[PDB]
Amino acid sequence: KNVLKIRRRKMNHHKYRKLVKKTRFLRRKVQEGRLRRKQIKFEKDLRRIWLKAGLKEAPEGWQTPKIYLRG
Amino acid sequence: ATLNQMHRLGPPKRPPRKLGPTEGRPQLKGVVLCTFTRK
Amino acid sequence: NPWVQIMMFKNMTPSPFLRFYLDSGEQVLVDVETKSNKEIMEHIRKILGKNEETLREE
Amino acid sequence: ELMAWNQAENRRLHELRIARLRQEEREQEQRQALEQARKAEEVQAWAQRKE
Amino acid sequence: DPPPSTLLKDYQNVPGIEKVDDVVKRLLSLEMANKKEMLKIKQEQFMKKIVANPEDTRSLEARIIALSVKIRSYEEHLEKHRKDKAHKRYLLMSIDQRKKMLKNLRNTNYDVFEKICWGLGIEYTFPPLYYRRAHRRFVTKKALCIRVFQETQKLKKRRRALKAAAAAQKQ
Amino acid sequence: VRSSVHARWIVGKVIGTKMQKTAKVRVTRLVLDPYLLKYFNKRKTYFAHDALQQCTVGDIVLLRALPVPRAKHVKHELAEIVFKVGKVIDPVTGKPCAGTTYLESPLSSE
RNA sequence: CCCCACUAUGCUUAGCCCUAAACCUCAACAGUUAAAUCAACAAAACUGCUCGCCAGAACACUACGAGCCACAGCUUAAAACUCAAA
RNA sequence: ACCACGAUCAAAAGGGACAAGCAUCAAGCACGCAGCAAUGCAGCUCAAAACGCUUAGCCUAGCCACACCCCCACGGGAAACAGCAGU
Ligand SMILES: [K+]
Ligand SMILES: [K+]
Ligand SMILES: [K+]
Ligand SMILES: [Mg+2]
Ligand SMILES: [Mg+2]
Ligand SMILES: [Mg+2]
Ligand SMILES: [Mg+2]
Ligand SMILES: [Mg+2]
Ligand SMILES: [Mg+2]
Ligand SMILES: [Mg+2]
Ligand SMILES: [Mg+2]
Ligand SMILES: [Mg+2]
Ligand SMILES: [Mg+2]
Ligand SMILES: [Mg+2]
Ligand SMILES: [Mg+2]
Ligand SMILES: [Mg+2]
Ligand SMILES: [Mg+2]
Ligand SMILES: [Mg+2]
Ligand SMILES: [Mg+2]
Ligand SMILES: [Mg+2]
Ligand SMILES: [Mg+2]
Ligand SMILES: [Mg+2]
């Protein structure tokens, strides 16, 4: 068989990798912002729980950890 | 597929029919903005 | 008999048997070892199946 | 009457089972006798080789 | 482990083995043999200690005992060879096959299942119903939901005493 | 004899004993697949009152409906342990068995 | 593309990463060689049973979401517009 | 007619059953049990699809739901044809 289908995929992946290289600094700023919103969306999910259970503050001694940071 | 697989998958789910430029309607009213020619 | 629970059990005992649980609480043990499938169907029809008259009436 | 007839059919099948099981023990014992003989020779042969 | 002076399973029942020279006893002992010979002696001890017929090797009991000896050999092997991925696979597969044997023995002969567990020191465990990744977001939310439950329980008990106290005052 | 519970007699397998005096029982029924016209097991969970806590996970039990439910999910009581897990008694002969093999021969008591 | 020099790298140790035309592109178990042998080519045609997967092309080994020691990554993976073919 | 220890009819309550699409909605977060109570145990649902989002009146001798909105209607917004004819 010919490799014409492979050749299409080859070009797509090449142009994709090149696009990522050309915009890797903008993508890093966007990725950082998404992780911040992801952490906020996570904190809201937990706060909803204790508030809907009748508590007014977080359980004594509870600190929501940062589960999306590289550290 | 096997009978167990066909039972587990169920009947085939066919995607809801797409709506064309009329949004599933025979005609639409419009206001002309500009006229031109296309090749 | 869509409303009768039928449950199957493999290789739990040395010989095959059918057991029926009735609403009164009575249990009917039917030994089926050595019997053909047609004889099993005729046996349980006789002891626990509705006769042709009872069905004609319904 | 049908429950009693079914209980009698089970008793009949039980007597046929016990007769079938007795014939299987006599055959099982014959085989079990030969295997012990064969197994005893293989032990004596294996024991002599080790000795 | 059996003492090194233990004789091989093949030479333990030959007549007159106790009157031979000490050198001949060393040459027919575990000290002068490979580890596989020591595992055959371990398998024999477990059989007499557990199974009703120590000569029946095809029973589900004997297979569980044989596989348990292999499992212990893999664990000792991997204690010294921690990057041996081939034997790590054999251990995990063997543990899964003993659980599959123990399941079938528990379903068929519970009295024998109990003696196998006591004799071999196996703590039978029922499988978990759901195997799913406990990722960070799940492990944190589940922890918070347990803390919220514990706090709600405490508050509900302090709403029993205050109501109890006020009711007594009316009297 | 009347009861408000729909399922009057059901057989199932005990799958849980972590509740006090309550056995969690998986009951399977055959349900016809309308398109394939093949029967497939459909399983449902029932809580059964077990006063003596004699049920073990894996044994086949017979459940009887209560006159009225005793709890939100407890609508049945343990009526009989049909097949004790690993301790099955052959109903046809009355002798103990381990799978398809007898542990005591029926010829012992003739 | 050809010649020379030299580095990351190929090696060891301790951790990661988890991708290949990872393809013998031919799933596991059991069975058959008779009937119709059989689109073509390839590595002859089939049966039982089970799981996995597939449903025009392209968009797309992409977007978003989610998970991940991965932060120019991997896994899962669409839709709109477009074509009457591929 | 009134009574029928009843029949018919049919609420509430209890048990069971009961739409479609999406798993890129995979976890839900108290969803269980025992006890006369006190209280104790830590369970309950879920890849055989829970929880969630979106779409839709339905299984048509008819049925369900709604009746301007705030699911409800003390109260409030506000002043109501989704009764007929009509605009
Ligand atoms: K691949
Ligand atoms: K290849
Ligand atoms: K309303
Ligand atoms: Mg070529
Ligand atoms: Mg392209
Ligand atoms: Mg170098
Ligand atoms: Mg080297
Ligand atoms: Mg290769
Ligand atoms: Mg492949
Ligand atoms: Mg496979
Ligand atoms: Mg084959
Ligand atoms: Mg396609
Ligand atoms: Mg790739
Ligand atoms: Mg990607
Ligand atoms: Mg992304
Ligand atoms: Mg009602
Ligand atoms: Mg109801
Ligand atoms: Mg998406
Ligand atoms: Mg609507
Ligand atoms: Mg109006
Ligand atoms: Mg209203
Ligand atoms: Mg009108």
Curated annotation (Swiss-Prot), chain A:
Keywords: Mitochondrion, Nucleus, Ribonucleoprotein, Ribosomal protein. The keyword Ribonucleoprotein applies. It is found in: Mitochondrion matrix; Nucleus. GO terms for biological process: mitochondrial translation; negative regulation of mitotic nuclear division; positive regulation of proteolysis. Ubiquitously expressed and especially highly expressed in heart, skeletal muscle and testis. The keyword Ribonucleoprotein applies. GO terms for cellular component: intracellular membrane-bounded organelle; mitochondrial inner membrane; mitochondrial matrix; mitochondrial small ribosomal subunit; mitochondrion; nucleoplasm; nucleus. Belongs to the mitochondrion-specific ribosomal protein mS38 family. Component of the mitochondrial small ribosomal subunit (mt-SSU). Mature mammalian 55S mitochondrial ribosomes consist of a small (28S) and a large (39S) subunit. The 28S small subunit contains a 12S ribosomal RNA (12S mt-rRNA) and 30 different proteins. The 39S large subunit contains a 16S rRNA (16S mt-rRNA), a copy of mitochondrial valine transfer RNA (mt-tRNA(Val)), which plays an integral structural role, and 52 different proteins. Interacts with Aurora-A. May act as a negative regulator of Aurora-A kinase, by down-regulation through proteasome-dependent degradation. This is Small ribosomal subunit protein mS38. The lineage of its organism: Eukaryota, Metazoa, Chordata, Craniata, Vertebrata. The gene is AURKAIP1. The chain holds residues 128 to 198 of 199 of the full protein.
From Swiss-Prot, chain B:
Residues 6-26 are annotated as: Disordered. It is found in: Mitochondrion. Component of the mitochondrial small ribosomal subunit (mt-SSU). Mature mammalian 55S mitochondrial ribosomes consist of a small (28S) and a large (39S) subunit. The 28S small subunit contains a 12S ribosomal RNA (12S mt-rRNA) and 30 different proteins. The 39S large subunit contains a 16S rRNA (16S mt-rRNA), a copy of mitochondrial valine transfer RNA (mt-tRNA(Val)), which plays an integral structural role, and 52 different proteins. Belongs to the universal ribosomal protein uS12 family. This is Small ribosomal subunit protein uS12m. It comes from Homo sapiens. The lineage of its organism: Eukaryota, Metazoa, Chordata, Craniata, Vertebrata. The gene is MRPS12.
From Swiss-Prot, chain D:
Coiled coil: none annotated. This is Small ribosomal subunit protein mS26. Component of the mitochondrial small ribosomal subunit (mt-SSU). Mature mammalian 55S mitochondrial ribosomes consist of a small (28S) and a large (39S) subunit. The 28S small subunit contains a 12S ribosomal RNA (12S mt-rRNA) and 30 different proteins. The 39S large subunit contains a 16S rRNA (16S mt-rRNA), a copy of mitochondrial valine transfer RNA (mt-tRNA(Val)), which plays an integral structural role, and 52 different proteins. The chain holds residues 104 to 154 of 205 of the full protein. It is found in: Mitochondrion. Belongs to the mitochondrion-specific ribosomal protein mS26 family. Disulfide bonds: none annotated.
Swiss-Prot record, chain F:
Disulfide bonds: none annotated. One of its GO terms (molecular function) is structural constituent of ribosome. Residues 1-17 form a transit peptide. It is found in: Mitochondrion. GO terms for biological process: mitochondrial translation; translation. It comes from the Eukaryota. This is Small ribosomal subunit protein uS17m. It comes from Homo sapiens. The lineage of its organism: Eukaryota, Metazoa, Chordata, Craniata, Vertebrata. The gene is MRPS17. The chain holds residues 4 to 113 of 130 of the full protein.
